[PDB]
Design an enzyme around this catalytic site. Structure first.
Site, PDB file in Angstrom:
ATOM      1  N   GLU B  16       0.817  -1.216   0.000  1.00  0.00           N
ATOM      2  CA  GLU B  16       0.000   0.000   0.000  1.00  0.00           C
ATOM      3  C   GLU B  16       0.848   1.262   0.000  1.00  0.00           C
ATOM      4  OE1 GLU B  16      -2.582   1.456  -0.370  1.00  0.00           O
ATOM      5  OE2 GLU B  16      -4.291   0.131  -0.276  1.00  0.00           O
ATOM      6  N   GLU B 119     -10.548  -5.142   9.773  1.00  0.00           N
ATOM      7  CA  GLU B 119     -11.213  -6.121   8.991  1.00  0.00           C
ATOM      8  C   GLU B 119     -11.314  -7.473   9.698  1.00  0.00           C
ATOM      9  OE1 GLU B 119      -8.549  -4.891   5.959  1.00  0.00           O
ATOM     10  OE2 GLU B 119     -10.102  -4.169   4.590  1.00  0.00           O
ATOM     11  N   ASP B 202      -9.988   1.577  -4.624  1.00  0.00           N
ATOM     12  CA  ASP B 202      -9.027   1.512  -3.528  1.00  0.00           C
ATOM     13  C   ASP B 202      -8.150   2.737  -3.568  1.00  0.00           C
ATOM     14  OD1 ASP B 202      -7.344   0.572  -1.514  1.00  0.00           O
ATOM     15  OD2 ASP B 202      -7.346  -1.491  -2.158  1.00  0.00           O
TER      16      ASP B 202
HETATM   17 CA   LIG Z   1      -6.007   1.373   0.082  1.00  0.00          CA
END
Ligand SMILES: [Ca+2]
Ligand SMILES: [Ca+2]
EC number: 3.1.1.17
Lengths: 297, 297
Positions: B16, B119, B202
């Site tokens: 990321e 999550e 995203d």
């Molecule tokens: Ca992301």
């Protein structure tokens, strides 16, 4: 030899939930944002209308008399002649901008109905905010699953062992194993993924051969699907784009009735499709459907 | 034509926050659940990694030296050199399991970053637990809005008058009017709705023509968007499904770098895409990006 005609130019904002009442040769349906339940006598051609205090997303027969309907987030019983509804149950008590969408009674008399966040449009709503519920005959409500985007068409196989279900923005018709005795479903799988030109899957009904008919919102069509082979068997195009749902009715369930929507159309579409929002009848398909089930509570 | 190269088969659990550091010709990135901040030297092809004490979801340049980063729900200064973090500010003190997700420095050197519930699957989490924040140069924090599902890509128009923003479970790229001088944002509106095949939006970056590139998680692609017309201008497909974010880098920002994730892949899928979690470089897009901004605090 297939004939498509508008039998009632009702100009629904969003016509939905067609149900055939064989004891009276009538079609019931709703107009969701108009808050309206309609009953059309196929012999006298007369329609009666009743208006509720919140969107009315589905209607079903009640064996003991009158109707049941999903009004806002409430399961309700309706006395047609008294124009009075009684709340049976309320769901989605934590959401605060949801509504019921499609619903239908199962082979044991249980009223299945799912919810959604309310919309300024298709994808345009809060996502995954709905759930599938069923109102049992003793007025208990079961919650099956959540994370539903837009709870839509549904029906049961003829041997009462499979439940078919559309969450519209999955673009998938799904199947679950289903237990007629307990109302329990399991083992979700996709049976059919729509093509691009088939647009958004909306309402659905099964026919007397076990095949599924799915209304394609914005696709101007119903499609016939074999849930066992996974193949599309047929496409029947309508003269309106915003086809929302379908059921069989008429003589020996040999006629298909299709609802559609006038909301969201531009002038230009409305010229071109002047019967948008009407009730359409399709004859000559060479297939018949089956009677609907009636709520048992 | 374009050319795609896995320049670092790093097998990240969830790679990321790619940031190009032109002063060292290196790509900065994180591997969120591994708790790592990473630098890949594009000349020697070697990678450094520093391990933090909680998930690290974004990293950005700090003008005064070293980096800033979001670790758990903390804005932190990272001394690369000692491998120590100093907390600048904390958020979501009331939450049973939040973390920061994507963050990026604005054109005035403010660190924007938003949160989400952690999550347990993708993307499955407690709904609406996040908020968008910015860390100002003197370390105070502004809270823009809450009810965020998954805070996630963001960037600014080239005239510094618009802020673009993705909450992933809205499946939408939004725009706000943005005031450079105060950091204030207003008049939220959607500028693009993903299609079903584009899956979950995203990370996101702007290019030198003012168009937006969005990584589509589970869509195996980046898409180029025109925020003025809402048109998708281009699709570039990647050899892996779980594309997570993208930035421009290389000489004069002429190359795109794309991160992705190995987490949640079937043994199956890995086998079909052995470089899942890698860092990909795309050449030949025919447009350049712009340099990252540096945190001013
Ligand atoms: Ca992301
Ligand atoms: Ca429907």
């Amino acid at each position: 030899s297939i004939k498509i005609e508008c039998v009632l130019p009702e100009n629904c904002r969003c016509g939905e939930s067609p149900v055939w009442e064989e004891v009276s040769n009538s079609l019931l349906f709703v107009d969701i944002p108009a808050k309206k339940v309609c009953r059309w006598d196929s012999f006298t051609k007369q329609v009666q209308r009743v208006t509720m205090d919140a969107p009315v997303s589905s209607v079903a027969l009640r064996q003991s008399g009158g109707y049941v309907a999903t009004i806002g987030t409430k399961f309700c019983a309706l006395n047609w002649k008294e124009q009075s509804a009684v709340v049976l149950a309320t769901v989605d008590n934590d959401k605060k901008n949801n509504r019921f969408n499609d619903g239908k009674v199962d082979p044991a008399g249980r009223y299945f109905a799912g919810t959604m966040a309310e919309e300024t449009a298709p994808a345009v709503l809060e996502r995954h905010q709905g759930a599938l519920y069923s109102l049992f005959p003793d007025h208990h409500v079961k919650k099956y699953f959540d994370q539903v985007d837009i709870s839509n068409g549904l029906d049961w196989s003829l041997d009462h062992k499979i439940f078919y279900y559309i969450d519209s923005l999955s673009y998938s018709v799904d199947a679950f194993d289903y237990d007629l005795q307990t109302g329990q479903i399991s083992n979700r799988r996709s049976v059919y993924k729509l093509e691009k030109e088939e647009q958004i899957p909306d309402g659905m009904c099964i026919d007397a051969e076990g095949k599924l008919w799915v209304a394609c919102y914005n696709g101007g069509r119903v499609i016939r699907l074999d849930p066992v082979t996974g193949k599309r068997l047929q496409t029947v195009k309508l003269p309106v784009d915003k086809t929302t749902s379908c059921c069989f009715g008429g003589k020996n369930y040999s006629e298909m009735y299709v609802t559609c929507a006038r909301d969201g159309m531009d002038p230009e579409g409305l010229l071109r499709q002047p019967e948008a929002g009407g009730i359409f009848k399709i004859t000559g398909l060479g297939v018949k459907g089956i009677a609907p089930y009636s709520y048992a509570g």
